[PDB]
Amino acid sequence: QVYISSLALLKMLKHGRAGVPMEVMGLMLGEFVDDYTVRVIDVFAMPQSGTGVSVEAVDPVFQAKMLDMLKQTGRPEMVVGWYHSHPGFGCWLSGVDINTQQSFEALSERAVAVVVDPIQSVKGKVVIDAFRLINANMMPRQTTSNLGHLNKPSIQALIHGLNRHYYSITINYRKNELEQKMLLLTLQDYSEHCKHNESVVKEMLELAKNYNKAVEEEDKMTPEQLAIKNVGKQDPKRHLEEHVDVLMTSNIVQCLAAM
Amino acid sequence: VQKVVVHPLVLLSVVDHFNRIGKVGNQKRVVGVLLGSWQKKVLDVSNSFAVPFDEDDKDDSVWFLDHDYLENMYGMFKKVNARERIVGWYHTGPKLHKNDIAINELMKRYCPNSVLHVTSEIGAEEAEEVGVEHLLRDIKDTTVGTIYQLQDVFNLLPDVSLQEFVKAFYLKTNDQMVVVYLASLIRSVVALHNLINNKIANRDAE
């Protein structure tokens, strides 16, 4: 349903992550065709107060004047709606609703905002969700059976009690091949080759002595998964595997390119 | 003086900007300024306007402005974030000429370092790669899951002189080969330990 250019996603994460928690805000720009398919191309970072920002961020001269400026040498069409930048927890909007819900119909019903999370999303899967005006009207969309993943939110009572008003739908994504593609020696005996095969073979010596002690010891009188893998005195044997792995990616490969 | 780092924030911004100006005609060196922290190695982290580029179509001897518009977006992003200073400016790929060095010089106003050349490094995207690693789906990063100068070029080429160097090269290879032989052994042993673990496991599951 709701679409994004994902430049709005990166400027979104930029403005959010830059200003935590401070709940930074802004408002994006796009176009409407039907019920709720909203292409969002650019988010507009409206400025920050001291520590608590509200409807006062809806300024005359900043969004009006700069909407004229990047209307001229940039994004031409009308705005969509706002956003909000929840740090930490996730998505529920208690004091946010009185500062956001009444603002929409001043413009249009074709107006969404979105709460994001640049703290708990360290991921490559960032928490994004728009919503509705279900302040009132408890009075269609076959969806293939209610869309799936909003019968799986973090089902928490204050969140789901917020979801009575909220009703998120989807977040689509676009990108192009160009952008995709874009994003996608030596050292020899300085001291290097010696002093990382003079090092690691010594831990292979006495760590293989402790591997000897491990195989001698656990051979008999062993039960219950070696007392839960020796959480204590970690860790024999695997250490040897790791050591073996470290040199054979190094003492060959760039040495190979030496040839 | 250090090099440049990168943030693909400005890369997606300029790429979307040439998705903007790509109407009928107008293959244009669209110059827009950057704002961000400038110090030792940086990127000038965020883009700006352009005052879009048109000369005649190729007669590139006439300019774009305002300096008050420089401090429109650069001035009123200070109301949003105050960490920034202009150095960076871009244009299209890949051709440059005296127009571009004349906007380095003529429209200078700070810009000591701004190549979009020794400052040549295309960065890491610190602390905001969450908006990159979500944007690195189908086909993935690797796959994830998988005359004077040229006169001085060949001054440092010739080496077949194997007496000394050859012997040395032979030797090092031998020593490192040995290391690998030593290793490729203890992982074979611990692999065999996993074999007897699996065989006694399924042997007891009989």
Binding site: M248, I252, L256, M259 | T173, S184
Partner: peptide
């Protein structure tokens, strides 16, 4: 030995 130089 570049041809000669299974581990994966």
């Amino acid at each position: 030995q570049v041809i000669e130089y299974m581990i994966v």
